[PDB]
Design a protein around this nucleic acid. Sequence first.
DNA 1: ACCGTAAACATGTTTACGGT
DNA 2: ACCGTAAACATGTTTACGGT
Lengths: 81, 84
Amino acid sequence: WGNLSYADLITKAIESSAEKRLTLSQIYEWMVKSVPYFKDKGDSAGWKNSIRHNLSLHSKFIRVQNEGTGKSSWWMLNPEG
Amino acid sequence: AWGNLSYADLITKAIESSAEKRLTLSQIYEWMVKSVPYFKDKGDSNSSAGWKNSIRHNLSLHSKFIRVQNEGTGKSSWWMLNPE
DNA sequence: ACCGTAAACATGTTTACGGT
DNA sequence: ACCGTAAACATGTTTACGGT
């Protein structure tokens, strides 16, 4: 596929969430459900490595501790960045 | 071979030894290597893979240890004691 | 310089097992 | 029941490289 970039797909996923925040697990399902090229890829390697790479690298994504036991962090858009 | 103290006991004494009563996982490794003689000669990630895995397992298994988001660039979380 | 892809490496989380 | 040990899997963080 082409279209937008990995950093743009994560942003479009976050903007659709009511609380303006999504865990890494939630981003995976949104990509499978919203992007047709990932529709058959709901099973950790490849494009899932690229998503984690983009979240830690780009300053426009911040990591927020989750208020749920055993749950991964919240990923939201950086206000300043 | 370090005594009758458990891993949770060793992690607790390390955390209690800090002024802020909180340490990162990397710092817990340093106290074990620096304070416990049995761990003094196993600082490299070859002889350490064993006990370093046991420490992360103890921090995540027992409710006594809690995780707090760090306040740095990409620093790992703080590990403190559960108020319970 | 940016992006996608790959890989090493660190940090957390659970599940399982044998010994005391 | 508790502990130590080992291991699978997930989640985060860096570094490198070819192509545009």
